Amino acid sequence: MALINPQFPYAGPVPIPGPAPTETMPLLNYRVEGRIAGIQQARQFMPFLQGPHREVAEQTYYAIGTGIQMGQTFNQPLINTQEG
Amino acid sequence: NNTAFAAVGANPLEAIYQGAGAADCEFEEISYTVYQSYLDQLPVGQNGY
Known about the structure:
Largest interface: A-B, 5 and 5 residues
Strand content of chain A: under 5%
Number of strands of chain B: 2
Distance between the termini of chain B: 48 Å
Number of helices of chain A: 0
Radius of gyration of chain A: 52 Å
Structural class of chain B: little secondary structure
Number of helices of chain B: 0
Helix content of chain B: under 10%
Distance between the termini of chain A: 124 Å
Protein name (chain A): Minor capsid protein
Largest sheet of chain B: 2 strands, parallel
Organism (chain A): Enterobacteria phage PR772
Radius of gyration of chain B: 22 Å
GO cellular component, one term (chain A): viral capsid
Strand content of chain B: 5-15%
Largest sheet of chain A: none
Order of helices and strands of chain B: EE
Pfam family, one (chain A): Tecti-min-caps
InterPro entries (chain A): Tecti-min-caps
Oligomer: part of a larger assembly
């Protein structure tokens, strides 16, 4: 967006020496076929386990029984003959 | 003992020490240790790794 100087104008570009025209043109680089080499193993001996863990520990229980329940020799009360 | 003790006036590009006593300099031993740095536990989807 330059302003044209009317007192000192200039013309378009003139030819100048050039950079040997084939040396600015590249070759198209020619890929050969390739292979991810080797026979891959199916599994890996991992350093960490792959499953979930638990944040807190919960107390577990198992039921037990008591035993054969016996009789008893109670201390027996007195007879309510109007004193009680 | 050849490629590591250049003399005074030799090319010290691949040498380690250079001096006027370099004709009698020698190694006693060289020990090396290699440490491999890799990525373990690779992700596996279907169609392999």
